[PDB]
């Protein structure tokens, strides 16, 4: 949740 | 898995 996988940015 | 909140970076499980 925020940058990274999942959610926010990232995949 | 991230910059956040849940594991990686910021809040829950690691820095």
Request: net charge neutral; proline share 0%; no cysteine.
């Amino acid at each position: 949740a925020x940058v990274x996988w999942x959610w926010x940015w990232x995949w | 898995v991230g910059a956040x909140a849940x594991v990686x970076w910021x809040w829950x499980w690691x820095w």
